[PDB]
């Protein structure tokens, strides 16, 4: 079973929410289709559900202005928020029944300011291994994703969090390689940032 | 609303350990869900319905308790079980624990250091930014130390921690040092000095502008 997020990162104030999950490999007309939403510290948040024959339940502090529905004809189903606030800036995710499996979530973010695509500077230079890196500078707002090589170094990657600045993020990105792999063979980081629906590829020059 | 209160906030763990992992309720519960977050992965169903295991996860783990108290059991702890761990119920208000981060215990590793001047790219924009990577080491307290020129540097230094790597136990860190190209282009050497429990000499990594 595999389920995936999609929507829009960033929702003004006052406006409303919208997200949908895409699930393959098992039918919506079966079992429990949850929402469920996560804030910075560690907290998580039911939201709610539709299950198989229709029938929605919400979180009680929710329910006043939530709503779930589903497309069956395209197996489905949606999640609707309104009246949002910086207080509903989180992680939103989608959950089968009894929150087995979940997709891979998306970070809506509630504000009125603009999307800023971010700057994607190399970090290059002997040994027999050598690291390389990427430096994601001046973006709004989160989150970005940065692979290496479409996920062909996983292993050796180290993801450095975001941090903060004048309004702005900045995160980095490194990458461990036999001194043989580069520069024999091209090295790149692919930095995207669906906010502003921009993707920045970055090859990595001795 | 129903409180679950999870203790303690951190624990931690040596390879082979069997800990327990605890989730204290408001009121009287039914049943316990217990769920498995590690980095970079969305947070994966570990036992349902107070013992019942999942699919797709080892005999190892194992939940125990009724009414207001239950238990997470894992044993043989491996690095891999490196993550946050939340306790669920479910009723006519279903929440989450707060959570219980796992951290791993391993021998003391020493941060390989690599030091990276500012892009071409970005200098024409005007920016200079000095990263220095230190990867894999333990235990997670160091202090990095940016000297210009000799004299060392406070203001403008950016420091960011990975989450404890699932594979060696080990974590990484990356200090940004920004300046303007005119404050970059003022000085000629640059260094980073990493100062880890490991070693009472300093790491250190630098370049020089020239």
């Known amino acids: 079973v595999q389920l995936q997020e999609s929507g829009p990162s960033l929702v003004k104030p006052s406006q409303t929410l919208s997200l949908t999950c895409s699930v393959t490999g098992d039918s919506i007309t079966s079992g429990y289709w949850n929402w469920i939403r996560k804030f910075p510290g560690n907290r998580l948040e039911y939201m709610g559900y539709?299950?198989?024959?229709?029938?929605?339940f919400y979180n009680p502090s929710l329910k006043s202005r939530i709503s779930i529905t589903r497309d069956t004809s395209k197996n489905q189903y949606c999640l609707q928020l309104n009246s949002v606030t910086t207080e509903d800036t989180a992680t939103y995710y989608c959950?089968?029944?009894?929150?087995?499996?979940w997709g891979q979530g998306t970070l809506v973010t509630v504000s009125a300011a603009k999307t800023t695509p971010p700057s994607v500077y190399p970090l290059a230079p002997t040994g027999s291994s050598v690291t390389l890196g990427c430096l994601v500078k001046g973006y709004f707002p989160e989150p970005v994703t940065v692979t290496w090589n479409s996920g062909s170094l996983s292993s050796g990657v180290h993801t450095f969090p975001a941090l903060l600045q004048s309004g702005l993020y900045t995160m980095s990105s490194s990458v461990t390689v036999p001194s043989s792999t580069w520069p024999s063979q091209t090295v790149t980081c692919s930095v995207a940032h669906p906010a502003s629906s921009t993707t920045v590829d970055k090859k990595l020059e001795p | 609303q129903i409180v679950l209160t999870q203790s303690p906030a951190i624990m931690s763990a040596s390879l082979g350990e069997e800990i327990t992992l605890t989730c204290s309720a408001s009121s009287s519960v039914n049943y316990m869900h217990w769920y498995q977050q590690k980095s970079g992965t969305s947070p994966k169903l570990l036992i349902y319905?107070?013992?019942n295991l999942a699919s797709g996860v080892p005999s190892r783990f194992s939940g125990s308790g009724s009414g207001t108290f239950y238990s997470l059991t894992i044993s043989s702890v491996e690095a891999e079980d490196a993550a946050d761990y939340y306790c669920?119920?479910?009723?006519?208000?279903?929440?989450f624990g707060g959570g219980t981060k796992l951290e791993i215990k391993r021998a003391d590793a020493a941060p390989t250091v690599s030091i990276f001047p500012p892009s071409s790219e970005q200098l024409t924009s005007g920016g200079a930014s000095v990263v220095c990577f230190l990867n894999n080491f333990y235990p997670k307290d160091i202090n990095v130390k940016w000297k210009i020129d000799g004299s060392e540097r406070q203001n403008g230094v950016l420091n960011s921690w990975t989450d404890q790597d699932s594979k060696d136990s080990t974590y990484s860190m990356s200090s940004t040092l920004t300046l303007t190209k005119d404050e970059y282009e003022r000085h000629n050497s640059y260094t980073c000095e990493a100062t880890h429990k490991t070693s009472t000499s300093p790491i250190v990594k630098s370049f020089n502008r020239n």
């Open positions: 319905t107070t013992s």
């Open positions: 669920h119920q479910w009723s006519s208000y279903p929440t």
């Open positions: 539709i299950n198989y024959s229709g029938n929605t």
């Open positions: 959950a089968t029944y009894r929150f087995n499996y």
